[PDB]
Design a protein around this ligand. Structure first.
Ligand SMILES: Nc1ncnc2c1ncn2[C@@H]1O[C@H](COP(=O)(O)OP(=O)(O)O)[C@@H](O)[C@H]1O
Ligand SMILES: Nc1ncnc2c1ncn2[C@@H]1O[C@H](COP(=O)(O)OP(=O)(O)O)[C@@H](O)[C@H]1O
Ligand SMILES: Nc1ncnc2c1ncn2[C@@H]1O[C@H](COP(=O)(O)OP(=O)(O)O)[C@@H](O)[C@H]1O
Ligand SMILES: Nc1ncnc2c1ncn2[C@@H]1O[C@H](COP(=O)(O)OP(=O)(O)O)[C@@H](O)[C@H]1O
Lengths: 529, 522
């Protein structure tokens, strides 16, 4: 009977924290932290009780909603799509300090830290109270592998395993990670819990679907199923290095792990705005060993493993993939399993198989359509499917119902841009040939596509070239548009301030202009020919 | 030319005009007058007696033809309004489709691609003196687009006194390469590979893929001292035997001394009753009766079959398109590796092919919920998805459109247009609109290749909004199911009753169908 209750929509981070609270992943915790537990966790990595818990888990609340919360009231925690997940009694509402929390938990207040930057968007108050679960978030990707602590413990049981090593990861797994985990099994003498994070990791990680597919194919094809469990963890990482390493240990223990792998640079976001590493490479191993007994999970530590061609094996240092994922290509068998490399190659296609939008902007009769047509032909002759969005196509399929106000014309540009950006998403080539006079509208379209995939072409011509180029009477009226045709005046054309290609049409034939766009496309690697 | 009337001609007529202008149809130099036309139709001859087996005429819609003045000069412009020639209006006459189709083609069956196109031709033919302004200009492989003069010059530069020509409208596999190189050895001269890049047959491999195939195959496998590659901008008629003779005339005008005529030469296949339009060797027999008069020797081949136990093609002694649209990889005994990879570039495996899931049904039926779930399932399987749901469509696509029947149709056609372009690039697009009008959804289907539009009927009762609506429009009320009626699909690919299936189960059922067709290999 939640319909009478006040509702709040919570962040994607809070949905994940709520989910893990509800399934017992954070045991002993069963609710968001109140003020006393919070402040002791921040200062000492301990709940008020004295139980170790290194990472604060709180529910932020904007001060405009906090102001009207009432002690003892039940509220509905709803997800970003408004689905009700839990009700919460509001027992505590308290102010937190960003820099104190960041400094103590993360070791830094540098906003280059992904979590520091995020904390600036968090509501100014934290709230706490008893939770009643309505439902868990529902997933439609790989629900077979999304297992609760209870399901994983019951699976360890079924396989007859007494010892289990857990592997944390937020990254695709290569053959170094495969060796890492398998050495760890043999060493501890138990099975293995592959436990990748699918909730929130670090901005700019490989997308979750690609990663999940990687973990799935690698588990099913390369691991012994009597000794190995795969399970997806809906964790919202803090990227808090050593403190998060400890946290991982507690979580994996609640899933039934007796052992936990910690390698080099565990749970670290890298380096700060000074270039200084956020954590020492083995600071996490260090803290973990100090607490491993109290937590009740044994650390299986690794020094940085390296590949030795002479041995064709991965050894400890005592004895990256930046040319491949970019415009480059498939990783070799000794670095990555073929099935994983193939999945990566589907996601990260070479630059000459990537989509891009050639946007041709300029004055009426500048020659946009002619150049577009020619370039489309040249591109198709090179094996590329092309969508050509010129005046006629756009006015037929996209423009109907729009007027000729500035707004309607910006709408039209943005419409063409949305369509072009969806085609680029699917690795298609789009050529757009519109006057598109408004610079901001065009900038907006650039912002719809991945960086480098918007080729803005400035088709430069003199003012009122139409007649010179034998476009007169009603044909010129058609080119100029309604306002200009009837009044003799229009909004000024706003040229691309820094286009990819500039084409001076008084100097180049439309074929030469088209060839110029082509040479840019080869230069960037969009065409190998 | 600014004082003259202008008319836009068809793509077919642009190509006929190009070939008239470069002398490919010599002795013809204009579109046919009524006397020439009738004697060509009836007896494969110009009024003068000169052999010409295929009519070349210029169709004009009845309303324009009526306003033409005897003896006047007009400008002939292409579909993009570029002026190619002026023509004097010396004749304007009606033609008869049944007359022309039955005599020239042997049939009036609309299954014949030309018969079907002829029903779109203007009802009058025009003829008179031509003065060329400019030839069509191309920007694909201009180096291989060669006039009769140029091919005849290149023949001399190679010092070849005999040249066998090869007609094709298809990719060349090893069978064709062996067919051409054997023809060449029989004749003892050179080879002119003369593929058609103008108009062929609907459903043919697109011209760009084909040209790239001819170019790589010629560049890496043919002896340059005896092989010429030239692209022919012919608008084929698919007229079998009669077209064979025509090809002979044309290739002779390019300098060919010999012409390959294989099985079923220039045939479009079978009619509506599943019968071949022409007999397999009728073209070879007709050609043999006129070859001396034409002045080009036929090099006939019996049908070449591949015999695995020899690794050789033999003429029977002592199809493929159905696996291109499936993205199957061709074996090295059948195709050269470079051709196989060009075809694989354009014809991707089925599980990588683009498709459109179009969820139609009443408001609150659950189209958006189902589409969102399906999107996730598809993304998890490694397909990027464009989701054209209500909110995406309303923000980006349908602003400025209202709720009138016209605007609702316009909106269905617009989302359909967008989906079709995504599909063209092998993307997955899920659309979730009421889209109540059946004719409009059918128009959207026709924007895509057969098998690529998955129409899903999300079947819920009319009053399902009672328990499901949150926005409040059903309570407040052009509403579909209440004011303006919904037209359900006659044969959707998938149907989901939503009073029985959960949104997850509905999406799972769509997944199942996509797996069955092979669009999703999990
Ligand atoms: N080359 C390596 N040598 C040793 N340990 C490694 C190596 N690469 C990764 N690891 C360890 O394996 C796990 C994989 O973690 P990863 O997904 O890269 O980031 P995170 O530590 O943030 O989960 C971590 O415990 C890490 O310390
Ligand atoms: N650089 C140029 N020099 C001479 N004529 C040109 C040039 N560019 C275009 N034209 C001609 O001007 C006319 C208008 O060109 P078009 O491509 O339609 O311009 P837009 O699409 O910018 O309105 C066409 O007939 C075209 O052939
Ligand atoms: N297996 C085969 N055996 C003999 N001749 C063939 C075979 N396949 C194609 N041909 C011949 O090769 C030429 C090109 O065939 P095709 O590409 O269908 O073009 P068209 O439709 O113009 O005949 C034609 O002369 C045809 O008869
Ligand atoms: N069995 C069901 N099938 C589809 N939708 C359902 C079902 N049961 C409840 N609903 C709800 O109906 C509401 C409206 O659904 P929506 O997907 O927006 O419909 P549409 O997009 O067809 O207008 C949603 O909140 C959805 O969860």
């Amino acid at each position: 009977k939640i319909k009478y209750l006040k509702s709040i929509q919570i962040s994607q981070r809070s949905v994940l924290d709520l989910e893990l609270l509800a399934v017992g992943a954070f045991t002993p915790l069963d609710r968001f932290m109140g003020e006393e537990d919070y402040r002791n966790v921040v200062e000492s990595m301990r709940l008020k009780s004295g139980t170790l818990f290194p990472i604060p888990i709180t529910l932020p609340m904007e001060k405009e909603i906090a102001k009207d919360l009432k002690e003892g009231e039940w509220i509905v925690l709803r997800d970003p799509k408004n689905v009700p997940l839990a009700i919460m009694r509001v027992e505590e509402v308290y102010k937190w300090n960003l820099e104190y929390e960041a400094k103590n938990v993360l070791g830094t207040t540098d906003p280059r830290h992904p979590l520091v930057a995020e904390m600036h968007t968090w509501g100014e108050y934290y709230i706490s109270g008893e939770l009643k679960v309505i439902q868990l978030p529902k997933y439609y990707d790989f629900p077979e592998y999304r297992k609760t602590p209870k399901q994983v413990r019951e699976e360890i049981k079924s396989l007859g395993l007494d010892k289990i090593v857990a592997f944390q990861t937020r990254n695709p797994m290569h053959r170094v990670h495969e060796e890492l985990t398998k050495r760890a099994m043999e060493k501890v003498g138990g099975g293995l819990l592959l436990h990748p994070v699918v909730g929130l990791t670090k901005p700019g990680d490989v997308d979750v679907y690609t990663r999940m597919r990687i973990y799935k194919v690698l588990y099913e094809k390369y691991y012994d199923k009597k000794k190995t469990i795969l399970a997806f963890l809906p964790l919202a990482m803090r990227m808090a290095g050593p403190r998060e390493a400890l946290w991982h240990g507690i979580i994996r223990r609640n899933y039934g792990a007796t052992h936990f792998i910690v390698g080099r640079d565990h749970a670290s976001p890298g380096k700060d705005s000074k270039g200084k590493p956020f954590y020492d490479p083995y600071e996490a191993q260090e803290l973990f060993k100090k607490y491993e007994d109290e937590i009740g999970i044994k650390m299986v530590p690794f020094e940085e493993l390296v590949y030795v061609p002479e041995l064709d094996q991965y050894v400890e240092i005592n004895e990256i993939r930046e040319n491949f994922l970019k415009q480059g290509r498939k990783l070799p068998e000794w670095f990555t399993r073929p099935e994983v490399a193939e999945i990566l190659a589907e996601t990260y296609v070479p630059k000459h198989k990537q989509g891009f939008c050639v946007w041709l902007t300029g004055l009426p009769c500048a020659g946009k359509s002619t150049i577009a047509e020619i370039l489309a032909t040249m591109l198709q002759a090179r094996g590329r499917k092309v969508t050509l969005l010129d005046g006629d196509v756009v006015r037929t399929h996209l423009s109907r119902g729009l007027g000729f106000s500035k707004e309607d014309r910006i709408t039209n540009i943005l419409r063409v841009g949305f369509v072009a950006s969806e085609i680029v998403k699917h690795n298609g080539v789009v050529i757009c040939a519109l006057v598109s006079p408004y610079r901001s509208a065009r900038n907006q379209v650039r912002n719809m596509m991945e960086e480098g995939k918007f080729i803005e072409v400035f088709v430069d011509a003199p003012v009122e070239v139409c007649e010179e180029r034998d476009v007169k009477g009603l044909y010129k009226k058609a080119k100029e548009g309604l306002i200009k045709g009837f009044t003799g005046v229009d909004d000024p054309y706003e040229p691309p301030v820094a286009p990819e290609v500039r084409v001076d049409t008084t100097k180049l034939t439309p074929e030469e202009s088209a060839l110029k766009i082509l040479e840019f496309l080869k230069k960037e690697g969009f065409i190998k020919d």
